[PDB]
Amino acid sequence: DRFGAFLPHDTSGDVAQLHGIGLQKFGDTWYAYGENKVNGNLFQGVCCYTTTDFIAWRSHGIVLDVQEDGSALAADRIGERPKVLHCPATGKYVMYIHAETPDYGYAHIGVAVADAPTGPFAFQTTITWRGYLSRDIGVFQDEDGSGYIMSEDRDHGTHIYRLADDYLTIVEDVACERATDYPYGLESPTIIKKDGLYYWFGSQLTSWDTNDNKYSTATDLHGPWSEWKLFAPEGAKTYDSQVDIVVPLDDDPYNSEHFLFIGDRWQEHDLGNSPIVQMPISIADGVASLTWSDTYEGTTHR
């Protein structure tokens, strides 16, 4: 395995744009969808990579292009935290993105659709629930085939939204949670399930600074959600990263004994070269725990 803090590269010799990624396993292969940030913070497309080992990353190029001027994904806009789900009812691959403007007032979800996980994805809609703000997003697909998008909403908390059966829009505000003793939900959400218990991870709102990220558990996605608790050591600032995704690695994604944590080390003035922190995360009996090891590469703080 490859664990620690590092700047990944693909098998073509380019920096792998594994920033704000979504990850999905289709067949025997992992698909990552990341923000292309080679030239800074504006939308430059969604990059796709595949792996079977989280060591070598094969590029599949830009799978959601920059769109034309006047659209919500034009070169002057912002598109972050892309996520993909495979829709059981339709067989399509649906991509979700935080569609944003430089003034940061837009706060929408963008929806694009493809016939294959490597695209090309065709940009369709921007949506909100009830007009509410949506910024950081994540996705979760349950054992019954239901799909969900998690969505940080600065005025209310972080939502779990249930998707329509065709995965193209939202039909239910399942939950909207603020962190314990906190006026907001946590951002950069990710959810996994193990032995009937859901684990929901997120980051505090501390701008560019890293913070001690936290998790909550529940036996129903509607809740009740437990107290939010740290999963890395206090003061470690999540090993100087911002949680992006946790994935189960075993054959049964809902009863796995091994999990992978990926967090972003955002570099404000060199975004395309932001490293990742890639580590095993221990998850059992309502407890999630992230621990550094001397053998890992890079440093616990950048």
Query: Distance of alpha carbon 153 from its chain centroid, rounded?
Result: 16
**Half-sphere CA count of 158, side-chain side, radius 13 A:** 33
Show Cβ contacts of residue 144 under 8 Å, excluding neighbours closer than 6 positions: none
CATH topology of domain 1-302: Tachylectin-2; Chain A (2.115.10)
Instruction: Determine the Cα–Cα distance for residues 275 and 7; give it in Å rounded to an integer.
Output: 4
Spatial CA neighbour of 16 closest among 272, 244, 262, 277: 272
Instruction: Determine the Cα–Cα distance for residues 209 and 207; give it in Å rounded to an integer.
Output: 6
Give bridge partners of residue 172 from the DSSP assignment.
Answer: 162
Instruction: Determine the Cα–Cα distance for residues 35 and 42; give it in Å rounded to an integer.
Output: 10
Give bridge partners of residue 245 from the DSSP assignment.
Answer: 262
Q: What is the resolution of this structure in A?
A: 1.4
**Residue ranges of the domains in the chain?**
1-302
Helix H, strand E, coil C: the string for the chain is: CCCEEECCECCCCCECCCCCCEEEEECCEEEEEEECCCCCCCCCCEEEEEECCCCCCEEEEEEECCCCCCCCCCCCCEEEEEEEEECCCCCCEEEEEEEECCCCCCCEEEEEEECCCCCCCEEEEEECCCCCCCCCEEEEECCCCCEEEEEEECCCEEEEEEECCCCCCEEEEEEEECCCCCCCCCEEEEEEEECCEEEEEEECCCCCCCCCCEEEEECCCCCCCCCCEECCCCCCHHHHCEEEEEEECCCCCCCCCCEEEEEECCCCCCHHHCCEEEEECEEECCEEECCCCCCCECCCCC
Q: Which residue has the tokens 């509607």?
A: 222
R_g of the chain, CA atoms, integer Å: 18
Angle at 260 between CA 217 and CA 151, to 5 degrees: 50
Query: Distance of alpha carbon 44 from its chain centroid, rounded?
Result: 18
